[PDB]
């Protein structure tokens, strides 16, 4: 009965494809607001209209485990493979599974060296989906069915 989306996140070097770490999905915030310029500082004309809305995808994982090879060897780019089982309301456990992926992501963790005095092991790593001029965001979804 517990929420049955124990997703498996694979963090792999986008440069070569070498697996970096593996973790358990914890949360995924989506935000869409027009913070470009001031509340309404966008550029427009009588015959011109441009969608200036910008959106950020923020992700957070837990219990990340690092590949031995990567720790050994040590513009860099990284990809995240989100692996979840599809659970429709009619069939709470469908054989078809949903593959999410964020091929481009930056390890911009908000941990920022937290020195709490508590004996808890939760190195929650934040992620922001980086973009480019051609690609608005790099998130991609697929349906197995």
């Amino acid at each position: 009965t517990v929420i049955q989306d124990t997703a498996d996140v694979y963090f792999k070097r986008k440069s070569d494809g070498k697996l970096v770490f593996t973790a358990e999905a914890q949360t995924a915030s989506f935000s869409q607001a027009i913070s470009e310029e001031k509340l309404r500082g966008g550029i427009g004309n009588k015959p011109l209209y441009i969608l200036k809305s910008e959106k950020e995808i923020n992700l957070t994982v837990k219990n990340a485990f690092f590949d031995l090879e990567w720790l050994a060897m040590t513009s860099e780019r990284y990809e995240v493979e989100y692996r979840t089982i599809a659970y429709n309301p009619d069939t709470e456990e469908v054989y078809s599974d949903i593959y999410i992926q964020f091929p481009n992501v930056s390890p911009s963790g908000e941990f920022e060296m937290s020195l709490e005095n508590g004996n808890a092991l939760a190195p929650e790593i934040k992620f922001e989906a980086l973009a480019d001029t051609d690609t608005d965001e790099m998130a991609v979804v697929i349906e197995a069915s």
Binding site: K38, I50, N117
Partner: protein, 702 residues
């Protein structure tokens, strides 16, 4: 007997003089609960069966005759006690007190972030162990954790034999805290340091880490107090509160109970009298901050304290915001003079900036309206911000910035620059802040999008002088020069680039041309195609000849190129080639979607361009019937092309935010869909509590 009263209170309070400051509450531990020292300053007569020696002391404080008959030594003791109680904040009994006042008086160098004076005091010679204690706190605050650890060891070595109980005890606490700091820091450098920084930053050398690991093993903090001599524990019960690792639980739960009371008061719509629960939390918050900072304890750096102060300040802000809008009832306002409104001061600014995060400052901004609260003491805050910028520029002017001090200071600098939107600054301060932000803020910790949005935030309360235009133009030209290389790609987390800096400049100053970019263009060549693309974005920001050269070198025939030309004003109407090109893209996307049907559907990005095309079709821009054939990808496309056929059940209300005033009016003018949008919005503003929906509803009252 006045003399007996003075002697007794002096015997109770003499050891407390060594401490720089003591909390009001903890004073109850001094008198064995005889009196309950309220935070306000008063001292209510808790159950006791003595003389009432506090009553006679306050009488002496009132009458000059009573303190003039005191013996000379007793007179010096009495005026010393008077000085001490004036310092801490105690006043008089509760019955006598008619009206009291409150103020914040933290005056440590650490609290005002005085880094230069801190290091100067460090390098200057010392004369006493108190000086070494302040030196060590300054070092640790400065990031030189290894030096701070060694200095604390030396202080302990001298204090164990110099018979300074307070110094020895607090130094033990501080050494344990700094050890924890270094240990967790190296553990973050080893594993996560590689991913985060891209290197194995090892500021601490291996032999040093081993030295600390074997130096203070099997040291239980919970036993420290019980190890101290009997006299220290008998006379300094106030400090037992610090020994336990899980300290400040009491304040956390007491803040939990005063958060429940204040929330109930908001819910009912009550009218509190005397000392409100908000005043108690405020007094306790600035009595904890003052105690810890003035007494120089390292525990003020950890995360527990950050969480505690975040919750306290957030609660105060929401309570003030609620009270700003209250039911009149012609009853409460009459009782007390005018209103004790919440106004922001410099101490509040320092607290918020230091102890919050940028994600936590956005929450407080989304819940309440911070900008309605009034800010005071502008000059002090300008001094704080200019100091921050000077430090960052000095550190990034060279290649030497302590990695462990760069982790401790970047969050504070970020929060300060973020929260400095509301405060007012002078033109020199504006120039200094903008230049530091744009030129010397590390690119790993603040990428282009965040940089642009913070610069935009600063320029809201203060308009832009010409110096800011010059500074931003210099930074932009620096980027344009950097883009000569054919391997330089931009990364924008929020979706904002240098083109938006150009937008800000050409907005705040309508007429402006950067000749540096013009001469850069004059040297432009076909080989540097990437430079042509980057510098093509800022077309109005160049000169006429530069524009002619850029136009001659390349055309605008591509989807991204067409979008850029639309955004920068290069192209105003879609030519037959343009409509053909977009139709071509739509056909390619259609075949891709057909393929995806048998291979799963991916739809995030192309629906962006398709949504823009649909909006263009709605507003009578695209005049080709071909777009109707491309209907099939259901992401705002059909809803804007064929409103009637589209199933209005599939409609998502959140699509209304991204539209503009003109688009809102045009959609409201559409009769084929108005009823369903208005019903969705009205059930959406009736079930949810987002004001922006109510604004869209004001547009949609029709």
């Amino acid at each position: 007997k006045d003399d007996e009263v003075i002697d007794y209170i002096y015997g109770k309070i003499s050891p407390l003089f060594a401490l720089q400051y003591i909390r009001k509450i903890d004073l109850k531990h001094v008198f064995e609960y005889d009196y309950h020292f309220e935070v306000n300053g008063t001292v209510v007569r808790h159950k006791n069966k003595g003389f009432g020696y506090m009553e006679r002391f306050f009488e002496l404080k009132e009458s000059c005759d009573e303190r003039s008959k005191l013996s000379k030594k007793q007179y010096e003791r009495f005026n010393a006690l008077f000085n001490f109680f004036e310092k801490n904040g105690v006043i008089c009994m509760a019955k006598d007190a008619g009206t009291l006042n409150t103020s914040i008086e933290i005056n440590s160098l650490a609290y005002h972030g005085k880094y230069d004076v801190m290091k100067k005091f460090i390098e200057e010679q010392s004369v006493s162990i108190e000086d070494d204690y302040k030196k060590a706190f300054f070092l640790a605050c400065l990031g030189r954790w290894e030096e701070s650890y060694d200095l604390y060891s030396n202080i302990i070595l001298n204090s164990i034999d110099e018979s300074n109980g307070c110094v020895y005890y607090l130094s033990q606490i501080n050494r344990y805290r700094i050890y924890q700091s270094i240990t967790q820091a190296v553990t973050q450098f080893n594993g996560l340091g590689l991913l985060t920084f891209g290197r194995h930053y090892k500021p601490f050398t291996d032999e040093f880490l081993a030295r600390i690991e074997r130096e203070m093993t099997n040291f239980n903090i919970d036993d420290l107090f019980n190890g101290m001599p009997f006299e220290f524990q008998k006379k300094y019960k106030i400090l037992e509160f610090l020994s336990d690792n899980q300290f400040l639980y009491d304040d956390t739960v007491k803040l939990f109970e005063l958060t429940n009371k204040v929330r109930s008061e908001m819910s009912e719509g009550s009218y509190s009298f005397g000392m409100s629960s908000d005043i108690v939390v405020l007094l306790r918050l600035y009595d904890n901050l003052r105690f810890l900072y003035e007494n120089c304890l390292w525990s003020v750096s950890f995360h527990e304290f950050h969480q505690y102060i975040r919750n306290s300040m957030s609660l105060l802000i929401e309570k003030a915001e609620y009270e700003r809008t209250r039911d009149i009832d012609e009853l409460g306002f009459s009782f007390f003079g005018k209103k004790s409104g919440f106004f922001m001061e410099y101490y509040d600014f320092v607290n918020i900036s230091r102890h919050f995060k940028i994600d936590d400052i956005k929450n407080l901004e989304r819940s309440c309206s911070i900008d309605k609260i009034r800010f005071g003491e502008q000059e002090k805050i300008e001094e704080y911000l200019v100091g921050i910028a000077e430090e960052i520029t000095k550190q990034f002017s060279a290649n030497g910035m302590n990695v462990v001090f760069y982790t401790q200071f970047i969050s504070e600098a970020k929060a300060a620059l973020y929260f400095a939107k509301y405060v007012k600054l002078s033109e020199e301060g504006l120039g200094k802040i903008v230049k530091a932000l744009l030129f010397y803020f590390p690119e790993r910790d603040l990428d282009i999008g965040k940089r642009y949005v913070w610069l935009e935030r600063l320029t809201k309360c203060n308009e832009l002088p010409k110096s800011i235009i010059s500074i931003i133009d210099d930074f932009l030209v620096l980027q344009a020069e950097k883009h000569i290389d054919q391997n330089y790609s931009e990364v924008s987390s929020n979706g904002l680039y240098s083109r938006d800096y150009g937008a800000l400049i050409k907005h705040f100053e309508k007429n402006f041309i950067s000749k540096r970019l013009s001469e850069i263009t004059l040297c432009l060549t076909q080989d540097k195609q990437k430079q042509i693309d980057f510098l093509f974005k800022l077309l109005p920001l160049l000169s006429t000849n530069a524009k002619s050269h850029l136009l001659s070198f390349k055309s605008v025939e591509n989807i991204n190129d067409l979008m850029n030309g639309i955004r920068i004003g290069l192209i105003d109407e879609f030519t037959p080639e343009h409509e053909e090109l977009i139709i071509e893209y739509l056909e390619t996307r259609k075949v891709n979607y057909i393929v995806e049907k048998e291979k799963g559907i991916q739809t995030f990005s192309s629906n962006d361009y398709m949504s823009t095309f649909g909006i263009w079709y709605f507003l009578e821009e695209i005049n080709n019937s071909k777009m109707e054939e491309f209907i099939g990808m259901d992401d705002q496309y059909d809803f804007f092309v064929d409103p009637e056929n589209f199933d209005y059940k599939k409609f998502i209300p959140s699509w209304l935010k991204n539209y503009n005033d003109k688009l809102l009016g045009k959609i409201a003018g559409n009769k084929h869909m108005k009823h369903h949008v208005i019903e969705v919005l009205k059930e959406r503003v009736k079930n949810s509590n987002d004001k922006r929906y109510l604004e869209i509803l004001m547009n949609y009252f029709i």
